[PDB]
Amino acid sequence: EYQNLFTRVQVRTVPEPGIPIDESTGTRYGTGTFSYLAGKFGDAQIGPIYLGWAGVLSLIFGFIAIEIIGLNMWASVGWDPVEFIRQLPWLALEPPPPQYGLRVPPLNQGGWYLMAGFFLTVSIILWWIRIYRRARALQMGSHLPWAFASAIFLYSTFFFQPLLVGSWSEMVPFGIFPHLDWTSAFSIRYGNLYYNPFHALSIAFLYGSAVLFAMHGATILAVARMGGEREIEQITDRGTAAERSMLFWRWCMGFNATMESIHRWAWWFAVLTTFTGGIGILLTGTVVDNWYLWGVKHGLVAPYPAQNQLTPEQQDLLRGRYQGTAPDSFPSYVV
Amino acid sequence: AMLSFEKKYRVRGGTLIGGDLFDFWFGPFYVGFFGVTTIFFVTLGTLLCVWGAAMGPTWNLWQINIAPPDLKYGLGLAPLREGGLWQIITLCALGAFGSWALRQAEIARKLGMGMHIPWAYGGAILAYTTLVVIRPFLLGAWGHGFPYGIFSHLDWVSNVGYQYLHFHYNPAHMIAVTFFFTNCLALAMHGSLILSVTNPPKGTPTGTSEQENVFFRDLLGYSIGAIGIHRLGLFLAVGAAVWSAICIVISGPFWTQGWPEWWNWWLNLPIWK
Amino acid sequence: PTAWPVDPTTGQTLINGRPVVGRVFIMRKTDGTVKYPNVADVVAHEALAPLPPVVGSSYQQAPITNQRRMRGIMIQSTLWDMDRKRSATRQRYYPASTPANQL
Amino acid sequence: AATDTVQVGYRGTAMEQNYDHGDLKTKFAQVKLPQSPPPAGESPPGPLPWKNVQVLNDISIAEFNRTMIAMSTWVAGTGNCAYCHNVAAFQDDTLPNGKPLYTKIVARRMLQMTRNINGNYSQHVKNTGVTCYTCHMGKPLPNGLWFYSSQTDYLRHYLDRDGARVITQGVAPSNANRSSTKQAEWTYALMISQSRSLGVNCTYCHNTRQFASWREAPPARVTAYHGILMLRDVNQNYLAPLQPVYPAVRLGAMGDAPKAQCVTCHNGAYKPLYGAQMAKDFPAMWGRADWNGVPFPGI
Amino acid sequence: GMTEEEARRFHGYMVTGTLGYVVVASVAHFLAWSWRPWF
Amino acid sequence: GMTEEEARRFHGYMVTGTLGYVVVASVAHFLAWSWRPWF
Amino acid sequence: MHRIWLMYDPRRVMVALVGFLAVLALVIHFVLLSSQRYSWIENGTLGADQAPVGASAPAAAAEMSPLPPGR
Amino acid sequence: HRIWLMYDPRRVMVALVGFLAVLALVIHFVLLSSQRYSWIENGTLGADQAPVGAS
Amino acid sequence: MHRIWLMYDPRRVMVALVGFLAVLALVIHFVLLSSQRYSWIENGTLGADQAPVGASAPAA
Amino acid sequence: MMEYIDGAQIALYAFWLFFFGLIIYLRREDKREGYPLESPQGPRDGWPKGAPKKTYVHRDHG
Ligand SMILES: CCCCCCCCCCCCCC(=O)OC[C@H](COP(=O)(O)OCC(O)COP(=O)(O)OC[C@@H](COC(=O)CCCCCCCCCCCCC)OC(=O)CCCCCCCCCCCCC)OC(=O)CCCCCCCCCCCCC
Ligand code: BCL
Ligand code: BCL
Ligand SMILES: CC[C@H]1c2cc3[nH]c4c(c3C)C(=O)[C@H](C(=O)OC)c4c3nc(cc4[nH]c(cc(n2)[C@@H]1C)c(C(C)=O)c4C)[C@@H](C)[C@@H]3CCC(=O)OC/C=C(\C)CCC[C@H](C)CCC[C@H](C)CCCC(C)C
Ligand SMILES: CC[C@H]1c2cc3[nH]c4c(c3C)C(=O)[C@H](C(=O)OC)c4c3nc(cc4[nH]c(cc(n2)[C@@H]1C)c(C(C)=O)c4C)[C@@H](C)[C@@H]3CCC(=O)OC/C=C(\C)CCC[C@H](C)CCC[C@H](C)CCCC(C)C
Ligand SMILES: *[C@H]1O[C@H](CO)[C@@H](O[C@@H]2O[C@@H](C)[C@H](O)[C@@H](O)[C@H]2O)[C@H](O)[C@@H]1O[C@H]1O[C@H](C(=O)O)[C@@H](O[C@H]2O[C@H](CO)[C@@H](O)[C@H](O)[C@H]2NC(C)=O)[C@H](OC(C)=O)[C@H]1OC(C)=O
Ligand SMILES: *[C@H]1O[C@H](CO)[C@@H](O[C@@H]2O[C@@H](C)[C@H](O)[C@@H](O)[C@H]2O)[C@H](O)[C@@H]1O[C@H]1O[C@H](C(=O)O)[C@@H](O[C@H]2O[C@H](CO)[C@@H](O)[C@H](O)[C@H]2NC(C)=O)[C@H](OC(C)=O)[C@H]1OC(C)=O
Ligand SMILES: COC(C)(C)C/C=C/C(C)=C/C=C/C(C=O)=C/C=C/C(C)=C/C=C/C=C(C)/C=C/C=C(\C)CC/C=C(C)/C=C/C=C(\C)C(=O)O
Ligand SMILES: COC(C)(C)C/C=C/C(C)=C/C=C/C(C=O)=C/C=C/C(C)=C/C=C/C=C(C)/C=C/C=C(\C)CC/C=C(C)/C=C/C=C(\C)C(=O)O
Ligand SMILES: COC(C)(C)C/C=C/C(C)=C/C=C/C(C)=C/C=C/C(C)=C/C=C\C=C(C)\C=C\C=C(C)\C=C\C=C(C)\C=C\CC(C)(C)OC
Ligand SMILES: [Fe+3]
């Protein structure tokens, strides 16, 4: 039984699409080409790209953001090109020190960070505009830019939540392992992010997005021999591939989508992943400072038997201090 | 009830075990032999979960917690109050999830479909079977499984992560996370493209495969095509679960230190040791 | 009051003045767990709240050779405790720097 | 390739320690095989002849000589009295050249330090206690020596810093806790170091669903806290003031004295020497009126 | 499609190959036994 | 497939190659055993 | 017994055989090289009596444990 | 035996050789993991010297 | 024996052989370079008596 | 002041009201094909009632 997982016979066409649909202003950049490797898994044409004014500016602003990050990373290993490659995943451009709050920090102590963050943010907004204009030029609905707006919303909460708590130090460092260090320390600082209910919801939609794309990917491949991958024609002119897809899920779990409406389930699950995420970040440190204690208050937290019991003098002895400033001297202890 | 086109499709045939005996429907649901076994394991497993809640400290849905046994019991069945109930429920869950996959195969066979859906679901069953069977068995005790409880299993995930000090540094976990994030991106793009050609602005004709290929091409620089995006979505979603199973089975049975110190091999490549 | 009275003439447990046939045990939910009443009750079992931070009145810079050029906060545990390479170790701090007329 | 596990919390919470069984057996045998055996001890009468003994005033002459044999094997290799002494004149604190015997004057301070550890920090070291062997392990230099380097170095938690807490003990934000996420990164770095110093993971001292919880944590967290307070006393009052005593080859680039940390005693094991009890055999080092009910044999 | 003549020819090799394997394995076991018994 | 003549001619090479290889391995083990015996 | 080969392409048999021997050889070498006794790149110059031998027993003091205490 | 007619010999030839190979490797690695039979490290111990599980 | 070049394309076996030898050579050199005994770039000028040796049995 | 009610709880119920509204919307969309259901008792809609079947206009080409 053929699994339809890769294409044993590709066909070339000598003239090509890639010359766009009628598109007006801007320019089509490059000539279309075929990759045999792309043609094995998907459609073979690797080809022309559109930018317009918003796409050009997005690349300029974004390139500067990437240069600032990389140059700071490379400066942080003393310009050593070997250590730059060897240590790359540990390198960061790091946000300002906490004592500045929202004030402008020194250039080497977060000033480059805020600059890179600014140009990256402008670059992301200009890319959204580029996508929005392109969807309308191709005479399409606006579903894709609003889906991308959901991702941008979560991203912006890595600026607004630091703004709301009042310090740029709380922002995410640019760096592969360093931003994962931040991700862990954020959950630590705010008392275990598992008990943030919007984080829990965001996971429910992240997992649900995998569930849906596994189900939908498999479903369409299972009817692809009957033309089920021609999804637009199955929507406008329902064939037996659509009917069988509906009946499979109906007979399996008692209800079904349509060939159109499964793409709405898909769209909302993906969009709600980052939308619920952003709400959870914005609530953290502004409304709730310890999510586990919010869980205790609202009854989320399962009880376990006590692992230790403190006496009252231990309760006073074992309180620490909140962490302060680092020692700005090298004491002699000699007398 | 039936969809307006359904009745024509409701033939006998395509079963794996029961032949005609269980080859019937109940409302919308196809039954079959694995439908019968599904409902058996679902009902037994659910009622034992309710019994676990009854003998626990609360009925609060979030706080119910049916915990595995202590590690000292090894691979034996513990006393039922002490984790043996978790072990019975785990057997029911395996029986249910297996029955569900095989029932999907009977349904696919009756509709003349490919077997993609049963196997794609096997990726999730693999991940579950890794967490409760394979990894506990390699560690030598069923007590290494996660507790059945809506938040108490999140306490397990937290503590397992910090058993390796900084679980983000697990290299298979980085791959699995990358697949989950790439999948959610790809799902949003594919969902958006189909809806945008089928629901264009008012007063616009319905779009075409050419327009979505043109749009997709200047988004990624290449056109993936209609079969390609479904192959990719299946690859990313199922690949995430497979790499998830890898990332947890290597943690403990095969690697025991913190995950950050696994990366010492990269620092010591002889070109730059 | 952790166990019911026992009849000396039989060893039989008396509950509310009347015997029980059997070995009495005090019932409890799984492993003696009890749901958490309140945040105030959970906090009452913990240590007292931490004392305020010690913050220095004003800041003196370290010598330039004591300043790290990597500003990432976890680098000492995530990289440097395993990385022993001599060149990379030398790159960790800024080199000495002196006004030319002081040389 | 088998993995040993120890459960340290409730069922299903995954509070567990994992060890590679082969790796652990080689570490454990590598302790057993070198572990230095003690002399037997004996009980004479008579008054003390010593010319320049200032710490060991309170032990019999036989117990004193027994202690010196132990100190030699634990720090210098057995019978190596020449490491500390002008062996012609044990009472001397200087060479014949008049240049001071720096090791002897350090060793006198290390006796006071050991007594102070075993006496005042019994909430940490309990009845295992420490001897010179715990750190030195037969060699002049212990492991885990550290010096000044940068202001934000987390090992200064064991010297002149104090606060490490970052979690709020309430639901809502408050002025009580203004900790940065960077400060939580700093505590996280510090805590990885403590975990590696003992060869354990975070669940040995925490239920990581709430790091701030003491009730949900194993009791080891309370022992660990007393270890921090002990190291601050050890570093601030005994190790760091030895700066003018050492040769400059021992000092750091700031000219500071070498300081200790958790790994100095623990050496990657959950207890030093996997819990080998030696302090009980050497009353010269108890600093305590009885060791586990055995009374101090004072003069 | 096997004939029962092909079967009789094949079965002679299969049985004797099995005997050869069993001979070598049982010599291997007796050497192992003489070096380090497991009962 | 191939004629009986070719399967026989091939089997002669396979047997001879196997035995020649096993002879060279026998010497390798003789040398290893001389240097550091494992029983 | 040669009739076994009538089922097979002899070129493919040889490619199958060489691949089997190459994997088996490398597995046995890397197992030995990872041992103590046969770590020959570091210790090959040791005489047979000087080479490592696995412990006929471990040992301990009674209060020592390799593993921490816990349920 | 007509079992060679119910089953194709080539199918059963490769299947058995595979099963024997998997079984042999499982038994070698099991023994190599044991104390008593970790023969690469301790193969030269005499039978009186080789380890034994406790009574 | 030359008849194997009718059974197999010489053009393709040669490429496979050159690739196999290159990989095996690089593997063995890096295995040695990572060892103590044969870290020849750092210690190549030591005499054979002075070069490291992996630890012996204690013979006790 | 309100002890129990807090802004995270309020925001969560706002989401639940939206999310159930969304599921209703999606289930109406799921019923544009194959509905009303055939049954022995006559036509059946389930709940919610499906949106009407949708007509698509093709283009006049160029
Ligand atoms: C946080 C992120 C979440 C992320 C995850 C989110 C998941 C979202 C998807 C799942 C929910 C949709 C499920 C669904 O639509 O099933 C079809 C079913 C009926 O289909 P129908 O076409 O409208 O009608 C058929 C009927 O006309 C003719 O059928 P027949 O005569 O053959 O058989 C009789 C029917 C009788 O109906 C039932 O028995 C209903 C069974 C329960 C319905 C769902 C209740 C709520 C969830 C389950 C709670 C009990 C669960 C234990 O028999 C059937 O039709 C059986 C087939 C349907 C089986 C559905 C099983 C769904 C299980 C969902 C599990 C969810 C777990 C969380 O629909 C319904 O009964 C009504 C559903 C209404 C939408 C649900 C949301 C309501 C929000 C609240 C609004 C206010 C109150 C309504
Ligand atoms: C110890 C670690 C903590 C933790 C800390 C956090 C923190 C902190 C956060 C999350 C967040 C998320 N976590 Mg969590 N998380 C933990 C445990 C988990 C587990 C698990 C099995 O244990 C899972 C599955 C998850 C899952 C998730 C996701 C549901 C969610 C992110 C959604 C998303 O799409 O993000 C990926 C998508 C994005 C980041 C959007 C990006 C879009 C922009 C526009 C892209 C720009 C690209 C640009 C153009 C190119 C730049 C180039 C470079 C400059 C070079 N977490 C534990 C409890 N988690 C986030 C969240 O929403 O929390 C509520 C979040 O902020
Ligand atoms: C050439 C055709 C035959 C052959 C014909 C003979 C004849 C004829 C004689 C031997 C002899 C010997 N053969 Mg023979 N032998 C063959 C294949 C083998 C193989 C093998 C792996 O296939 C092996 C291990 C041997 C091994 C041996 C020795 C046991 C023995 C002593 C000589 C010696 O040391 O040769 C070492 C060689 C090898 C280990 C490998 C084989 C090398 C090639 C194939 C040449 C073999 C011929 C032999 C060297 C000729 C000796 C000269 C005399 C004048 C005949 N032969 C082939 C298939 N062999 C002699 C004997 O029995 O003495 C007791 C002897 O008279
Ligand atoms: C619904 C939630 C999910 C989501 C969705 C989503 N993301 C999206 C979209 C959507 C629907 C897009 O349409 C958009 C896109 O374009 O996709 C291809 C995007 C996007 N998601 C991205 C990433 C991304 N998404 C993520 C996640 C998510 N995306 C969620 C899971 C993540 C994660 C998990 O971390 C990442 C990293 C991008 C690939 C893309 C937005 C691209 C963008 O904004 O780029 C800005 C530009 C730059 C950074 C600069 C690049 C610089 C060049 C390399 C310079 C080359 C030189 C140049 C030519 C010089 C200039 C000269 C001029 C004269 C020309
Ligand atoms: C492999 C890629 C992803 C994937 C794919 C996938 N899942 C699938 C499918 C596919 C392709 C299906 O065909 C199948 C399906 O039919 O979907 C509607 C399914 C499915 N994925 C499901 C859920 C699911 N998938 C998940 C994950 C994923 N699924 C992967 C990320 C998750 C996660 C990450 O949490 C969940 C919750 C179901 C909706 C469905 C399988 C339904 C099924 O098996 O039904 C029969 C059994 C029951 C109805 C109940 C059994 C009850 C037990 C007997 C007792 C309870 C035991 C349980 C362990 C307790 C746990 C308590 C928790 C609080 C921890
Ligand atoms: C060098 O100075 C810094 C800055 O004071 C000290 O670090 C302090 O302590 C840490 C808990 C904290 O992390 C950090 O924010 C900071 O508050 C560092 O330990 C060194 O201390 C020595 O020098 C101190 C100094 O400030 O110069 C000195 O402090 C005392 O003396 C100064 C005047 O010289 C006076 O202004 C201070 O009020 C006074 N403070 C105290 C508590 O006595 C330290 O002296 C003492 C006894 O602490 C110095 O410490 C030592 C051991 O020499
Ligand atoms: C090292 O120096 C100390 C100096 O304190 C000597 O300690 C002496 O003996 C102690 C028991 C006593 O408590 C202490 O106060 C002190 O009296 C120690 O014995 C070592 O001695 C050698 O170096 C001495 C030095 O100071 O340089 C040296 O003594 C010198 O000074 C004294 C006067 O204080 C004088 O009597 C010596 O003649 C003089 N000698 C020299 C070479 O400068 C010792 O000299 C003598 C004779 O003892 C040195 O020891 C030897 C064997 O020469
Ligand atoms: C945790 O527990 C643990 C520790 C694991 C313990 C428990 C272990 C257990 C349960 C073990 C069970 C073992 C077992 C059970 O039965 C094992 C059974 C083993 C068996 C049956 C072995 C049989 C071997 C047979 C062989 C090798 C045959 C070779 C044949 C040859 C060479 C000739 C082939 C024919 C040809 C070439 C034809 C040519 C002509 C042709 C073609 C023509 O003429 O056409
Ligand atoms: C944990 O334990 C651990 C540590 C793992 C330990 C345990 C390990 C174990 C269990 C190992 C098992 C090993 C094993 C089991 O069977 C091993 C079995 C090995 C075998 C079968 C080897 C066979 C080799 C055969 C060879 C080399 C044949 C070569 C043939 C040649 C050269 C002829 C080429 C001629 C041609 C092409 C014709 C040209 C002429 C022409 C054209 C003309 O003339 O025209
Ligand atoms: C010569 O060219 C070279 C070779 C150097 C080029 C090579 C460059 C390289 C190697 C670059 C490598 C880059 C890497 C590896 C980057 C890794 C990045 C990661 C993983 C980032 C992850 C997360 C980052 C986040 C979430 C950051 C968010 C930042 C935000 C939202 C910042 C917003 C800032 C604003 C809006 C600033 C406004 C400016 C004002 C003045 C208003 O200040 C507030
Ligand atoms: Fe689709």
SS3 track for G15-29: HHHHHHHHHHHHHHH
Peptide bond into J48 cis (omega under 30): yes
User: Which positions in chain H touch G55 (Cβ < 8 Å)?
Assistant: 42
- Check: CB of residue A176 under 8 Å from CB of residue C78: no
Among D residues 8-67, those touching chain G with beta carbons less than 8 Å apart: 8, 17, 19, 24-25, 27-29, 31-32, 35
Using DSSP's 3-state secondary structure scheme, residue D19 falls into strand
**Contact partners, residue D94, CB within 8 Å, separation at least 6:** D86, D100, D101
Nearest of A41, A314, A293 to residue A190 by alpha carbon:
A293
- Say yes or no: CB of residue A251 within 6 Å of ligand 1: no
DSSP lists the bridge partners of residue B26 as B29
Helix (H) or strand (E) segment spanning residue A28: strand A28-29
- Check: CB of residue D13 under 8 Å from CB of residue B155: yes
**Contact partners, residue G21, CB within 8 Å, separation at least 6:** none
Q: Which of I7, I8, I54 sits opposite G43 (nearest CB)?
A: I54
Using DSSP's 3-state secondary structure scheme, residue B117 falls into helix
- Residue B145 burial (CB count, 10 A): 24
Place of tokens 């009042």: A166
| CB-side neighbour CA atoms (13 Å) of D257 | 21
Pairing of strands B29-30, B25-26: antiparallel
DSSP lists the bridge partners of residue A238 as none
CA atoms of B270 and I33, how far apart (whole Å): 8
Helices and strands (H and E) in chain D: how many: 8, 4
CA atoms of J62 and J46, how far apart (whole Å): 44
Cα B152 to ligand 3 centroid, rounded to whole Å = 75
CA atoms of D104 and D89, how far apart (whole Å): 12
- Check: CB of residue A197 under 8 Å from CB of residue A295: no
Compute and round to an integer the Cα radius of gyration of chain B.
Answer: 24
Q: A198 is written with which tokens?
A: 């919007």
Across the interface, do C53 and A322 touch by the CB < 8 Å criterion? yes
Q: How far is CA A159 from CA A62, A93, A118, D183, in A?
A: 17, 16, 10, 19
Cα A120 to ligand 1 centroid, rounded to whole Å = 44
Q: How far is CA D150 from CA A78, C65, D179, in A?
A: 17, 9, 21
How near does any CA of chain A get to the CA of C83, in Å? 10
Q: How far is CA C86 from the centre of its chain?
A: 36
Q: After which residues is chain D broken (C to N over 2.5 A)?
A: none
Residue I8 identity (one-letter amino acid): Y
Main-chain phi, psi angles of D94, to 5 degrees: -135, 155
Chains B and A touch (3+ CB pairs under 8 A): yes
**Contact partners, residue D46, CB within 8 Å, separation at least 6:** D61
**Contact partners, residue B158, CB within 8 Å, separation at least 6:** A192, A194, D208, D209
Tell me how far apart the terminal alpha carbons of chain C are, to the nearest angstrom.
85
Helix (H) or strand (E) segment spanning residue A49: strand A49-50
Among A residues 23-82, those touching chain D with beta carbons less than 8 Å apart: none
- Check: CB of residue D93 under 8 Å from CB of residue D101: yes
Q: B161 is written with which tokens?
A: 């992560």
Main-chain phi, psi angles of B148, to 5 degrees: -90, 100
Q: Name which of D155, D197, D215 to mutate to probe chain C: the one with the most chain C Cβ atoms within 10 A of its Cβ.
A: D215
Residue H13 identity (one-letter amino acid): M
Nearest of A194, D57, J54, I11 to residue B156 by alpha carbon:
A194
Q: A31 is written with which tokens?
A: 């000539």
CA atoms of B22 and B44, how far apart (whole Å): 20
CA atoms of C3 and I58, how far apart (whole Å): 62
Across the interface, do C35 and B267 touch by the CB < 8 Å criterion? no
- Check: CB of residue J34 under 8 Å from CB of residue J26: no
Judged by its nearest atom, the ligand closest to the C-alpha of residue F21 is 9
Pairing of strands C18-19, C14-15: antiparallel
Across the interface, do H41 and G53 touch by the CB < 8 Å criterion? yes
As to burial, measured by CB atoms within 10 angstroms (0-12 exposed, 13-18 middle, 19+ buried), residue B169 is buried
Indicate which atom in ligand 3 lies nearest the CA of residue F19.
21
Place of tokens 């471990």: G58
Using DSSP's 3-state secondary structure scheme, residue B66 falls into strand
Among H residues 22-51, those touching chain G with beta carbons less than 8 Å apart: 38, 40-42, 44-45, 49-51
Nearest of D22, D31, D12, D6 to residue D220 by alpha carbon:
D6
How near does any CA of chain G get to the CA of I47, in Å? 14
CA atoms of A70 and I55, how far apart (whole Å): 46
Helix (H) or strand (E) segment spanning residue E34: helix E4-35
Tell me how far apart the terminal alpha carbons of chain A are, to the nearest angstrom.
86
The DSSP call for residue B76 is S
Q: How far is CA B117 from the centre of its chain?
A: 12
Q: E39 is written with which tokens?
A: 């009962």
Q: D8 is written with which tokens?
A: 């340290």
Tell me how far apart the terminal alpha carbons of chain B are, to the nearest angstrom.
70
Place of tokens 């069977």: B133
Judged by its nearest atom, the ligand closest to the C-alpha of residue B225 is 11
| B190 assigned binding-site residue | yes
Task: Check if H11 contacts G (Cβ < 8 Å).
Answer: no
CA atoms of B85 and A1, how far apart (whole Å): 42
Across the interface, do H2 and E7 touch by the CB < 8 Å criterion? yes
Nearest of B153, B168, B189 to residue B263 by alpha carbon:
B168
Compute and round to an integer the Cα radius of gyration of chain D.
Answer: 22
- Check: CB of residue B17 under 8 Å from CB of residue J54: no
- Say yes or no: CB of residue F22 within 6 Å of ligand 9: no
Q: Name which of D4, D193, D208, D211 to mutate to probe chain B: the one with the most chain B Cβ atoms within 10 A of its Cβ.
A: D208
Q: After which residues is chain E broken (C to N over 2.5 A)?
A: none
Nearest of C80, A184, D5, D193 to residue B169 by alpha carbon:
A184
CA atoms of I15 and D131, how far apart (whole Å): 66
Using DSSP's 3-state secondary structure scheme, residue H28 falls into helix
Q: Enumerate the H helices of chain G as residue ranges.
A: 10-34, 40-43
Nearest of C77, B192, E16, I21 to residue A263 by alpha carbon:
B192
Nearest of J33, A250, A244, A256 to residue B26 by alpha carbon:
A250
As to burial, measured by CB atoms within 10 angstroms (0-12 exposed, 13-18 middle, 19+ buried), residue D127 is middle
**Contact partners, residue D52, CB within 8 Å, separation at least 6:** D91, D92, D93
Counted across chains A and D, CB pairs separated by less than 8 A come out at 157
Across the interface, do J35 and B205 touch by the CB < 8 Å criterion? no
